[PDB]
Amino acid sequence: RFGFRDSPFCTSLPRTIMGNDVRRISYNVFSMMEDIDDVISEGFILYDAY
Amino acid sequence: SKMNVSYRLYIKTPACLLPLSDYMRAQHDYVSPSSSRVYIKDPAVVYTRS
The strand ranges marked E within B1-50 are none
Q: Rg (Cα) of chain A, in Å, rounded?
A: 13
Contact, A39 vs A23, CB < 8 A?
Answer: yes
Contact, A26 vs A47, CB < 8 A?
Answer: yes
Residue B48's closest chain A neighbor by CA?
Answer: A32
Count of CB contacts below 8 A, A vs B? Answer: 6
Instruction: For residue B50, list chain A residues with Cβ-Cβ distance below 8 A.
Output: 28, 32
Look at chain B and count its residues.
50
Strands A20-21, A45-47: pairing is: unpaired
Beta-bridge partners for A20? A17
Contact, A42 vs A23, CB < 8 A?
Answer: yes
Structure solved using which method?
Answer: cryo-EM
Decide if A31 and B48 are in contact by the 8 Å CB cutoff. no
DSSP B13: P
Question: Residue B14's Cα: distance from chain center in Å?
Answer: 18
Rounded Cα–Cα distance for residues A2 and A48 (Å): 29
| Specified resolution (Å) | 3.0
